[PDB]
A paper describes a structure:
A peptide from [name] interactor [name] was among the highest affinity ligands that we validated by BLI, with KD = 2.6 μM. [name] contains an FP4 motif followed by four prolines. We solved a crystal structure of the [name] [name]-[name] peptide complex at 1.88 Å resolution. Only the FP8 region was fully resolved in the structure under the crystallization conditions, which included high salt and low pH. The peptide folds into a PPII helix with prolines 1, 4, and 7 (0FPPPPPPPP8) contacting the [name] surface. The FP4 portion of the peptide binds the canonical FP4 groove, as observed in other structures, whereas the 7th proline docks into a previously uncharacterized site on [name] composed of Ala12, Gly92, Phe32, and the aliphatic part of the side chain of Asn90. We note that residue 12 has diverged in EVL and [name] [name] domains, which may contribute the weaker binding of [name] to those paralogs, although we have not isolated the affinity difference to this specific change. Notably, a similar binding site at the analogous location is used by the Homer [name] domain to bind the phenylalanine of PPXXF motifs. However, this site is relatively shallow in [name], and modeling large aromatic acids at this position on the [name] peptide using Pymol leads to severe steric clashes. Homer contains a smaller Gly89 at the site of Asn90 in [name] and can accommodate the bulky Phe of the PPXXF motif.
Numbering used by the authors: 2 to 113, 120 to 129
Write the structure that this text describes.
Amino acid sequence: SEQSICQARAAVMVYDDANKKWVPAGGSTGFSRVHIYHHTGNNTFRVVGRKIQDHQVVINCAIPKGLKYNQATQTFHQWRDARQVYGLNFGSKEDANVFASAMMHALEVLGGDFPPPPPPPP
Protein backbone atom coordinates (compact mmCIF):
# COMPACT_ATOMS: atom_id res chain seq x y z
CA SER A 1 0.00 0.00 0.00
CA GLU A 2 2.02 2.88 -1.38
CA GLN A 3 1.53 6.36 -2.75
CA SER A 4 3.93 8.34 -4.91
CA ILE A 5 4.25 11.87 -3.56
CA CYS A 6 6.54 13.10 -6.33
CA GLN A 7 8.12 12.06 -9.62
CA ALA A 8 11.36 13.64 -10.80
CA ARG A 9 13.78 13.03 -13.68
CA ALA A 10 17.41 12.67 -12.61
CA ALA A 11 20.65 10.84 -13.28
CA VAL A 12 21.13 8.68 -10.18
CA MET A 13 24.70 8.51 -8.88
CA VAL A 14 26.69 6.70 -6.22
CA TYR A 15 30.11 7.65 -4.94
CA ASP A 16 32.98 5.23 -5.45
CA ASP A 17 35.20 6.10 -2.49
CA ALA A 18 37.94 3.85 -3.88
CA ASN A 19 38.28 5.64 -7.24
CA LYS A 20 37.22 9.05 -5.86
CA LYS A 21 34.50 9.59 -8.45
CA TRP A 22 30.76 9.53 -8.91
CA VAL A 23 29.56 6.52 -10.90
CA PRO A 24 26.08 6.02 -12.39
CA ALA A 25 23.91 3.92 -10.11
CA GLY A 26 23.35 0.46 -11.56
CA GLY A 27 26.38 0.82 -13.87
CA SER A 28 24.75 2.52 -16.89
CA THR A 29 24.60 6.27 -17.38
CA GLY A 30 21.26 7.86 -18.16
CA PHE A 31 18.18 9.45 -16.65
CA SER A 32 15.79 7.77 -14.22
CA ARG A 33 12.29 8.57 -13.01
CA VAL A 34 12.85 9.00 -9.26
CA HIS A 35 9.87 8.71 -6.90
CA ILE A 36 9.37 9.25 -3.20
CA TYR A 37 6.77 6.74 -1.98
CA HIS A 38 4.78 6.91 1.25
CA HIS A 39 3.57 3.67 2.87
CA THR A 40 0.14 4.77 4.04
CA GLY A 41 0.25 2.38 6.99
CA ASN A 42 3.76 2.48 8.43
CA ASN A 43 4.02 6.21 7.73
CA THR A 44 7.40 5.31 6.20
CA PHE A 45 8.94 6.69 3.01
CA ARG A 46 11.41 5.54 0.38
CA VAL A 47 13.14 6.84 -2.75
CA VAL A 48 12.71 4.57 -5.79
CA GLY A 49 14.16 5.23 -9.22
CA ARG A 50 14.07 3.34 -12.51
CA LYS A 51 16.05 3.94 -15.68
CA ILE A 52 13.84 5.48 -18.32
CA GLN A 53 15.36 3.35 -21.10
CA ASP A 54 15.44 -0.20 -19.71
CA HIS A 55 13.39 0.31 -16.49
CA GLN A 56 16.26 -1.10 -14.40
CA VAL A 57 15.83 -0.24 -10.71
CA VAL A 58 18.85 1.87 -9.73
CA ILE A 59 17.84 3.13 -6.28
CA ASN A 60 15.40 1.76 -3.71
CA CYS A 61 16.22 2.95 -0.22
CA ALA A 62 14.11 3.94 2.74
CA ILE A 63 14.15 7.47 4.15
CA PRO A 64 15.11 7.30 7.85
CA LYS A 65 14.03 9.82 10.43
CA GLY A 66 16.94 12.23 10.72
CA LEU A 67 18.37 11.86 7.22
CA LYS A 68 20.75 14.69 6.28
CA TYR A 69 19.70 15.65 2.74
CA ASN A 70 22.12 18.07 1.11
CA GLN A 71 21.51 20.28 -1.93
CA ALA A 72 25.03 20.81 -3.21
CA THR A 73 23.66 22.99 -6.01
CA GLN A 74 20.04 23.67 -6.88
CA THR A 75 20.23 20.69 -9.29
CA PHE A 76 22.51 18.19 -7.53
CA HIS A 77 21.41 16.74 -4.21
CA GLN A 78 23.03 14.04 -2.12
CA TRP A 79 22.75 12.01 1.07
CA ARG A 80 24.12 8.78 2.52
CA ASP A 81 21.31 6.44 3.53
CA ALA A 82 23.60 3.42 3.95
CA ARG A 83 27.35 2.78 3.68
CA GLN A 84 27.34 4.45 0.24
CA VAL A 85 26.65 8.03 -0.81
CA TYR A 86 23.78 8.73 -3.21
CA GLY A 87 23.42 11.71 -5.53
CA LEU A 88 20.68 13.03 -7.80
CA ASN A 89 21.76 15.05 -10.87
CA PHE A 90 18.46 16.56 -11.94
CA GLY A 91 17.40 17.28 -15.51
CA SER A 92 15.99 20.69 -14.53
CA LYS A 93 15.41 22.98 -11.57
CA GLU A 94 11.71 22.15 -11.74
CA ASP A 95 12.53 18.48 -11.12
CA ALA A 96 15.01 19.36 -8.35
CA ASN A 97 12.52 21.54 -6.50
CA VAL A 98 9.65 19.08 -6.53
CA PHE A 99 11.88 16.30 -5.25
CA ALA A 100 13.46 18.46 -2.55
CA SER A 101 10.07 19.81 -1.53
CA ALA A 102 8.68 16.29 -1.19
CA MET A 103 11.79 15.13 0.68
CA MET A 104 11.44 17.99 3.16
CA HIS A 105 7.80 17.05 3.72
CA ALA A 106 8.72 13.38 4.19
CA LEU A 107 11.37 14.37 6.74
CA GLU A 108 8.83 16.50 8.67
CA VAL A 109 6.26 13.71 8.81
CA LEU A 110 9.00 11.39 10.05
CA GLY A 111 10.25 14.02 12.49
CA GLY A 112 6.83 14.14 14.15
CA ASP A 113 1.09 21.67 16.21
CA PHE A 114 -0.42 24.44 14.04
CA PRO A 115 -3.95 25.80 13.53
CA PRO A 116 -5.83 24.41 10.54
CA PRO A 117 -4.92 26.12 7.27
CA PRO A 118 -6.89 28.82 5.48
CA PRO A 119 -8.91 28.20 2.32
CA PRO A 120 -6.90 27.82 -0.88
CA PRO A 121 -6.59 31.08 -2.84
CA PRO A 122 -9.33 31.91 -5.38
